[PDB]
């Protein structure tokens, strides 16, 4: 029953999808 709430990729890959539009438009990086 454990299964259709818990989310294996749900949640996770939500937060994942947002990292990479933080790098897409300003590059973390800076020195040099």
Same mark, same amino acid.
């Given at each position: 029953?454990? @299964? /259709? +709430?818990?989310?294996?990729? =749900?949640?996770?890959? =939500?937060?994942?999808?947002?990292?990479? /539009?933080?790098?897409?438009?300003? @590059?973390?990086? =800076?020195? +040099?």
């Amino acid at each position: 029953r454990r @299964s /259709r +709430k818990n989310g294996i990729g =749900y949640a996770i890959g =939500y937060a994942f999808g947002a990292v990479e /539009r933080a790098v897409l438009g300003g @590059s973390r990086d =800076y020195n +040099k």
